[PDB]
């Protein structure tokens with residue numbers, strides 16, 4: 127798949143807002159995911175002990191990871207499709223070390239859309255959301271193809 131320049135502009139426009147508060151967004155997203163799909167929290171050995179949302183919100187550790195994760199995704203999105211180099215080290219760690227099924231990548235894509243929709247209604251209408259979805263699908267499709275070559279295809 128290929129996104130048009132107009133679709134990238136919509137994605138990058140909302141992303142500029144996300145960058146005014148990387149840590150706040152990273153936090154909201156992770157928490158959202160963990161709430162609506164508790165199983166995913168099991169993948170994090172440093173977070174499993176987090177019982178309530180108040181526990182998550184207060185966790186300085188979940189916040190730094192939300193920043194590290196959003197920054198890697200931001201780096202990928204700005205490549206506007208030309209992200210193969212960035213995708214490699216990433217695919218290898220999630221398939222081989224952390225073992226994250228594609229399904230979990232879908233779930234987080236969902237959390238991302240939910241959060242942007244809450245915090246940025248004005249820059250996230252139907253078209254902006256279509257663009258963001260097409261972008262994350264692209265990302266997932268490439269990660270999946272990559273998982274396969276590394277012998278996981280989880």
Ligand code: HEM
Pocket residue numbers: 166167169170171172191194195196198199215216219220224226230231234
């Ligand atoms: C757009 C999606 C994602 C991006 C851009 C991303 C990015 C990252 C980055 C950059 C790291 C740092 C070092 C490494 O490469 O391992 C990381 C770590 C990790 N990721 Fe992700 N990730 C994504 C999705 C996921 C998902 C859905 C899960 C789990 C349900 C996941 C689980 C983990 C775990 C277990 C670690 C390491 C935790 C730690 O020791 O700090 N990642 N991720």
